[PDB]
Design a protein around this ligand. Sequence first.
Ligand code: HEM
Ligand code: HEM
Ligand code: HEM
Ligand code: HEM
Ligand SMILES: O=C1NC(=O)c2c(NCCCc3ccc(O)cc3)cccc21
Ligand SMILES: O=C1NC(=O)c2c(NCCCc3ccc(O)cc3)cccc21
Ligand SMILES: O=C1NC(=O)c2c(NCCCc3ccc(O)cc3)cccc21
Ligand SMILES: O=C1NC(=O)c2c(NCCCc3ccc(O)cc3)cccc21
Ligand SMILES: O=C1NC(=O)c2c(NCCCc3ccc(O)cc3)cccc21
Ligand SMILES: O=C1NC(=O)c2c(NCCCc3ccc(O)cc3)cccc21
Ligand SMILES: O=C1NC(=O)c2c(NCCCc3ccc(O)cc3)cccc21
Ligand SMILES: [Fe+2]
Lengths: 156, 156, 156, 156, 156, 156, 156
Amino acid sequence: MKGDKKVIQHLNKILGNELIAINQYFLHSRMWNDWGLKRLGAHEYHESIDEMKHADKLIERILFLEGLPNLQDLGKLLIGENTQEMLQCDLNLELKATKDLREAIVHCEQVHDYVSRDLLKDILESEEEHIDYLETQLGLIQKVGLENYLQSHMHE
Amino acid sequence: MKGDKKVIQHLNKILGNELIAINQYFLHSRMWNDWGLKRLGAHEYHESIDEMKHADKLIERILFLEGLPNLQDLGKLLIGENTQEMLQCDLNLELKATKDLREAIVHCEQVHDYVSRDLLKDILESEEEHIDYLETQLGLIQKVGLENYLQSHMHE
Amino acid sequence: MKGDKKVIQHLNKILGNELIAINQYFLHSRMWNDWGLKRLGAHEYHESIDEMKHADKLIERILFLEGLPNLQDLGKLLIGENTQEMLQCDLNLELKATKDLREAIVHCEQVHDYVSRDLLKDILESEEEHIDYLETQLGLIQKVGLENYLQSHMHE
Amino acid sequence: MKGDKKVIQHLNKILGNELIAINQYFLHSRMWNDWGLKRLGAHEYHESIDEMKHADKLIERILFLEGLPNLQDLGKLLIGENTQEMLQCDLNLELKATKDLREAIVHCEQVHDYVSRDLLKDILESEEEHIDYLETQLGLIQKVGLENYLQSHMHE
Amino acid sequence: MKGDKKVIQHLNKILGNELIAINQYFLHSRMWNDWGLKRLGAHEYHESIDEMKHADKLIERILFLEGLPNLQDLGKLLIGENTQEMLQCDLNLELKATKDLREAIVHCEQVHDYVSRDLLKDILESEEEHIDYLETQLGLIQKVGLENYLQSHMHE
Amino acid sequence: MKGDKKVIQHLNKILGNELIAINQYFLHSRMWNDWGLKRLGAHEYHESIDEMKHADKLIERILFLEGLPNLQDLGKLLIGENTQEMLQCDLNLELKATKDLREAIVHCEQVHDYVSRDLLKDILESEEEHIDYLETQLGLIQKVGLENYLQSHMHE
Amino acid sequence: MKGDKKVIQHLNKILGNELIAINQYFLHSRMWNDWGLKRLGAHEYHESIDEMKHADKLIERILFLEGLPNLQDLGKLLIGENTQEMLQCDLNLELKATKDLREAIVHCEQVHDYVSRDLLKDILESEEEHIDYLETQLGLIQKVGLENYLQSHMHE
Ligand code: HEM
Ligand code: HEM
Ligand code: HEM
Ligand code: HEM
Ligand SMILES: O=C1NC(=O)c2c(NCCCc3ccc(O)cc3)cccc21
Ligand SMILES: O=C1NC(=O)c2c(NCCCc3ccc(O)cc3)cccc21
Ligand SMILES: O=C1NC(=O)c2c(NCCCc3ccc(O)cc3)cccc21
Ligand SMILES: O=C1NC(=O)c2c(NCCCc3ccc(O)cc3)cccc21
Ligand SMILES: O=C1NC(=O)c2c(NCCCc3ccc(O)cc3)cccc21
Ligand SMILES: O=C1NC(=O)c2c(NCCCc3ccc(O)cc3)cccc21
Ligand SMILES: O=C1NC(=O)c2c(NCCCc3ccc(O)cc3)cccc21
Ligand SMILES: [Fe+2]
């Protein structure tokens, strides 16, 4: 089905953000596992998987709309060097992701691609849940202290 | 069955206390969940549900006694700004609630409304159990320190 | 995640309508039960529980958006004196509620809070279902007569 | 298999009657559901389904006989404005349907299309059963009163 | 509940489209079955059933909004004479359907009938899925040859 | 029970046709199996068995009516030497069979042997189902090509 | 455990190859699904998953050896425009992958990193199995013809 050219550009921009997030979360997960913080490693693994699923749906929608999904261009991974930085890196990425999602939804609504809008809204719900998780973790570090916070994430 | 007018006023006063507690504990619960202190959130949710069940019984008794249950007047919520304050606000409310229950039981006894007394004794038992929980948490904070206490209430 | 201040105002306005509905429906339920109209009492109980669940989700959303959920202000309960009046009082409340829901969705859309919009849309679907129920009950009173209508709501 | 051209015309006439009945009974069903007369709505739904199944079998037979099933022409729906009228409308349609079934069977017998006759006979058995149901409902309205009759059809 | 007059007109237009599709898909299904292409026949039968379910929901929504669902007016069925034509006929119908759905969604959004919009969005998702299927089948005919394509659709 | 002599002659004529078909279909089945076309072989085996069952019922009816079932005279088998010809031979035999069935039914009707007619109508329904199958297979050979049609009938 | 710097460089080069393969196979998979070639799509999906699992093990090994896994640099994807090209693009990539694996194993052996060698050997066995699959599909295209080959990959 011949999609709107600018919808497809937006879907490819969101896809680009998801591909960054896949790799950043996967690397953060395996860093945390290497460090023995297995609960963080597993949670971050599931965040990466969830972004893989979003990327899949975007790829599928783009192809249906007769566009070319862009899996070649990979933007800048934000990799932290300790737990606090890694969480804040994930949050910085998520805040750019939701900004782009909102702009993509505006455009889909304007050209009446209501099915693309619905897909993007579901992804935005998932990204807002991730922002909640991240904000909560950074707040817990302040409330229980870093040493306790890390302790609570050793065992899965 | 036509009840004693002052009994009914007492029941509506206890009902008003329970209505404050429902909302205060529900809000405290959801604040704790938002902060990632999910064990406190869950426990405080169950406290709110328990007050809802008490309010239901009081409403049912007032209507049986041919009074009008007052669900319109809502007194002042005592909302804390951190875990310690929130627990102490709950305890302050409970000590007012138990005082009012004792005075209501006295009057039920005097006019021989023994069934209303038994209902209020059962509610009083639940409220004393809540006082026990609250005093215990405040003591644990002193014993284990706030950071550990909060750590212990992150996970259900 | 810092929400739009006027969105939060609207969410608190919706929450306030839900808090009225919780108490109005609960009281109506318990009145119908006291009168032996247990099918109406049970259905109205489930309507109250549904509004409790909506209020919960609104509280959770307001807190996520870093606002303060208002559980203190309780608007006017519309309590009926017989079955026809109680149903019409519920319907009057619901119509006010959907009006406020629609105006809140308009503003969510305008500021691109698409997740808040989706939550309100879901609540609106539940409120329209309640309107359907109420309009149907009122029409059935006219079709079968009040005595038959009440007969048919004695037993669960 | 090359069918008799006039058998096929008869089968298309019967199909045309079933297509009217499908839509008429489906609309009547959904009206009764909307009004809260859910027992009527469910029964009328099953009548519409039963007509759908007859139409399928007729379509299949026409194609086997190398005719063209006519799903394009839709005759006049007989829609009531209240329960008594809707039942009479169904009965009026059913009396027309059995008249046409009888004439189609006559012709099948004359040209020795005994298998089409057997199909039409089965449909006629179903349509007479619907007449029995309809005559019975109209008779019950007289015996129990319209208000009682409607009351008995509120709940499934 | 009193719905918007033009919303109801849009909903009747969509319903009118679904009524055409039900009959077109059902006939195409039974033609394919008659020809021994039973996998196409079965798939097309499920397409017709899906349209029936959409029509049901539209009728229910129109009646709730106090409109009259129009099951009398049946537009032009697009019937093919071979498999390629039948698939293209279905696709031509679906493209008219999605244009009308998008225009209906615009109007629901403008009068704030967000529940009707959500229903139409769900139907639109189903229609785009059908378009995907149709475009894919037409493409497969080119990639594998017509004879192979039909061979692969003989057996369910 | 003393049957009509000409009915019994008609029943023996139908029996004779069934006896031809048993052997023709059984040989065709075993030819197809020998050629590796096992799906045709299995389907044709089941056609032969069904004919065996009809012959059994005809034998039983003739004896009940105090006639002598003729199993001695075997008419001409129509044996094909390739798939398309075998199917055509089965179809040719079936078209002779249904012509005889219709004339037999006419006579049963005339002399009021309604039970014999019902038996013959059932047999006729089975033979028209075989005609449907055969016409469909011949149609498929044209639509998918002989080589594909055969390919699709190698395996069960 | 401090690893050999040149081993880690080899592991990151293999990881780079796996990352190209993840995205190339995933895009090819979803292209094939879009075209209705679901068997190819599912198989290619499983190939992508397998490369993801290899990349995971490489990331984990690099981190254990105190290196930095490179998920930032994504090499050139080889995307085909039809089935034949897509298979050949996969084969061209795999043949570069096995050349790099062999050179990395040589270096692991020389520096006595026998565990990294064993990992790479296991990955090589997987890549040789992928080469077998690809060479086999290309051979089948010649043996059965492209139309049949694609037909055989329509359905799962
Ligand atoms: C375009 C990029 C990618 C896409 C679209 C993608 C997609 C997927 C999908 C759809 C799944 C299955 C999820 C499920 O249903 O449970 C999955 C699983 C997985 N992915 Fe990815 N992925 C990508 C990149 C990666 C990368 C770069 C890695 C590792 C460095 C990776 C590691 C994994 C792992 C370990 C699994 C679990 C497989 C299993 O054990 O079953 N993925 N991926
Ligand atoms: C007049 C005030 C209220 C009354 C009398 C009341 C009563 C009840 C009762 C009897 C139950 C069922 C408990 C059980 O047996 O498990 C219940 C459940 C519940 N209530 Fe309330 N309630 C009130 C106010 C509220 C408020 C203000 C909220 C939230 C803001 C709320 C949220 C809930 C929730 C979430 C549930 C559980 C529902 C479920 O998932 O099953 N209630 N309430
Ligand atoms: C040519 C006209 C139609 C034909 C031949 C037809 C045929 C059928 C058939 C064969 C079934 C399956 C019944 C069973 O065995 O359970 C069915 C189901 C159904 N039909 Fe129709 N139908 C037609 C029109 C309609 C219309 C106009 C509507 C609604 C306005 C409708 C609504 C339904 C529904 C709701 C179902 C059941 C779906 C489910 O399984 O949930 N049909 N139809
Ligand atoms: C007078 C002619 C025949 C009659 C009335 C007849 C009747 C029957 C009947 C009633 C059955 C049981 C069917 C069932 O209920 O499943 C049967 C089975 C069978 N018939 Fe015949 N048959 C006749 C001739 C033949 C011939 C000529 C052959 C082969 C050359 C044959 C081969 C078979 C086979 C293989 C079975 C399956 C037996 C088993 O494995 O259980 N029949 N027949
Ligand atoms: O919070 C409230 N509790 C109440 O009862 C109430 C109202 N009552 C109207 C009379 C309801 C009534 C009538 C007959 C009967 O037998 C029992 C009760 C009105 C506004 C607010 C409230
Ligand atoms: O009904 C009410 N809703 C409220 O939020 C409230 C009050 N809030 C004090 C601050 C509560 C707070 C503080 C920090 C935070 O991160 C989130 C929340 C006080 C009285 C009555 C109400
Ligand atoms: O309602 C309708 N029934 C029909 O058959 C039809 C049309 N037929 C085109 C020929 C379709 C055809 C071709 C070959 C075949 O073997 C069987 C059928 C066209 C418009 C509307 C209708
Ligand atoms: O296709 C059609 N849809 C319709 O509604 C209709 C007719 N309506 C009669 C009024 C039916 C009515 C009455 C009261 C009510 O509360 C809701 C509905 C008449 C002919 C054909 C059609
Ligand atoms: O193929 C044949 N069918 C027959 O019936 C038959 C013969 N009949 C002898 C009498 C068999 C009989 C006797 C008494 C009775 O109550 C019923 C039947 C002889 C040769 C060939 C055939
Ligand atoms: O793709 C990438 N892989 C990486 O490692 C990386 C970066 N490294 C930050 C250091 C992260 C680190 C710190 C301590 C430690 O013990 C292990 C690792 C930065 C940008 C991109 C990439
Ligand atoms: O990252 C990438 N996404 C792509 O689509 C792509 C390339 N496409 C070649 C055409 C692929 C194609 C051809 C026909 C068709 O109907 C649909 C798609 C090439 C390099 C990198 C990328
Ligand atoms: Fe600790």
